[PDB]
Design a binder for this molecule. Structure first.
Ligand SMILES: Cc1cc2nc3c(=O)[nH]c(=O)nc-3n(C[C@H](O)[C@H](O)[C@H](O)COP(=O)(O)OP(=O)(O)OC[C@H]3O[C@@H](n4cnc5c(N)ncnc54)[C@H](O)[C@@H]3O)c2cc1C
Length: 489
């Protein structure tokens, strides 16, 4: 039986390992940290639990597909569907509580924004058709097509560009709404891959379909249960783990992978699958191999700055997912992507899992995950940025919720783009690999195979097909399909 080594226990690596296991490989995952899940990590601090990374759960069938590979194993993983997606607030007092029932969303949005129902209806149906077309056409495509060098392979993208909105920006399509608050609400979806609504293509209007047509869910135990259930499953089906052991080099011979090295020794495998960020994969682990320099130089997605606050009271106006919109979104993104700094009026996301699992906070308290969009680390003075952002975020919460939250903070943890970078070796602290700030960027990501080194594969959020849970999971599926194909040949 052949063996595979997976470099990193992120969601992509865990998924890949599970798939290779199902195929019959023996599998070992190396992890630099003393925990599994990478960005899907959690902490418990002074009476509060916090998810550290992903907070939004859509497309739960993609996780279930992994359990389905091992129908006999007993893994407790469940989730519920929510009636409400997000609460949205603005400085002028406007609040929109957004239903996951599309009929109710359209009616509510119509009244709250004084906007024609037909406009909202047509937009959501177009968002749906975009998703289904993109899924059918690009995410379900077969792997028949092969070759010795890199290729574009998407005349279909050009056929369908007018319908998908590939030649305009997200904001071009979102500016159809008359109320600018509604334009803003839908421009927010550019953050779902760390891009700007003013640059990312119009195909991204499909993103709200995920949470508004397909459901918004909450897993039992919070988001941490996603990586941990998968870790538990992996361990039960025989995947081996080497924790606190960073891979330092990927070994080859005669242009085929032979295994990896760590500070502790060398290990051989028939296959290597890296779940490490593609930049240090080349820069650090393949120092003797020629790097695809343009791929590695693609613009980096945005990062984040997060404050985790225990809060000594309740806010009945807040649900699980809440947004306090900046009064000037265009400036917000300009700072982030053009100047690598922070605008003074931020869009603040407040996530509160204690609304779903009351054990996540003391009785009558809340566990606030408080996040603003942020540039990656390019040498800024992060100490000053954090100090400044804190005061602006507190100012934002006074404008929108009419409370001085500083009187209620009982404990604080902070995560910056430096912390993000250190935690998981994500280059620049970018949350989603390369940004998607033009129509080529998706088609310019590193593939899941490697054209120089046979039997070396790549999985996760910095490579094809993209950042975020659903796409990282597809990364692993595609990687495993490739390998099975190669076996058959
Ligand atoms: C704050 C935040 C919020 C987010 N929210 C969302 C969300 O709501 N929805 C969403 O879809 N996505 C979200 N994301 C993004 C999402 O978390 C990632 O894109 C995705 O989970 C990353 O998966 P991955 O497979 O790339 O693995 P990663 O999570 O990046 O982890 C990779 C693993 O590899 C390990 N590793 C690296 N180098 C080595 C080495 N040399 N040796 C051994 N091990 C190594 C790392 O330590 C890490 O454990 C969020 C990200 C952040 C930071």
């Amino acid at each position: 039986m052949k063996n595979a080594i997976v470099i990193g226990a992120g969601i992509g690596g865990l998924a890949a390992a599970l798939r290779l296991r199902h195929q019959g490989y023996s599998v070992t995952i190396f992890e630099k940290n003393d925990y599994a899940g990478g960005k899907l990590h959690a902490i418990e601090k002074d009476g509060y639990r916090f998810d550290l990374g992903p907070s939004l759960f859509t497309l739960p069938h993609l996780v279930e597909n992994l359990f389905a590979l091992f129908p006999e194993e007993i893994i407790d993983f469940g989730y519920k569907s929510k009636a409400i997606s997000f609460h949205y607030f603005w400085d002028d007092g406007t609040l929109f509580k957004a239903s996951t029932d599309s009929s109710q969303f359209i009616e509510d949005a119509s009244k709250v924004f004084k906007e024609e129902k037909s406009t909202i209806k047509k937009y959501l149906a177009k968002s749906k058709s975009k998703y289904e077309l993109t899924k059918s056409l690009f995410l379900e495509k077969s792997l028949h097509k092969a070759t010795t060098y890199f290729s574009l392979d998407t005349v279909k993208a050009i056929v369908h560009a007018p319908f998908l909105g590939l030649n305009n920006t997200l904001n071009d399509e979102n500016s159809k709404f008359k109320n600018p608050k509604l334009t803003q609400l839908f421009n927010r979806y550019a953050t779902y891959n760390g891009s700007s609504p003013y640059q990312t293509p119009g195909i991204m209007t499909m993103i709200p379909h995920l949470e508004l047509g397909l459901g918004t869910y909450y897993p039992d135990g919070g988001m941490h249960r996603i990586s941990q259930s998968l870790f538990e499953l992996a361990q039960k089906v025989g995947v081996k783990f080497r924790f606190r052991e960073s891979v330092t080099n990927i070994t080859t011979s005669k242009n085929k992978v032979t295994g990896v090295e760590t500070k502790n020794g060398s290990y051989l495998s028939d296959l290597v699958v890296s779940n490490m960020d593609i930049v240090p994969t080349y820069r650090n682990l393949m120092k003797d191999v020629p790097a695809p320099e343009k791929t590695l130089s693609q613009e980096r997605s945005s990062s984040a700055l997060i404050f985790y606050w225990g809060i000594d009271r309740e806010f009945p106006e807040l649900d699980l997912h809440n947004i306090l919109f900046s009064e000037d979104y265009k400036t917000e993104f300009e700072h982030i992507f053009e100047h690598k700094t922070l605008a003074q009026d931020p869009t603040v996301y407040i996530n509160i899992t204690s609304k779903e699992s009351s054990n996540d906070a003391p009785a009558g308290h809340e566990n606030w995950f408080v996040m603003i969009n942020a540039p990656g680390d390019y040498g800024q003075d992060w100490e000053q940025l954090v100090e400044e952002s804190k005061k602006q975020i507190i100012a934002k919460i006074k404008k929108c919720l009419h409370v001085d939250i500083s009187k209620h903070i009982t404990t604080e943890y902070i995560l910056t783009p430096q912390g993000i970078e250190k935690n998981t070796s994500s280059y620049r602290g970018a949350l989603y690999g390369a940004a998607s700030n033009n129509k080529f960027a998706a088609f310019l990501r590193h593939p899941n195979f490697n054209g120089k080194i046979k039997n070396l594969y790549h999985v996760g959020g910095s490579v094809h097909p993209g950042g975020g849970i659903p796409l990282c999971l597809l990364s692993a599926q595609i990687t495993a399909d490739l390998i099975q194909k190669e076996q058959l040949e």
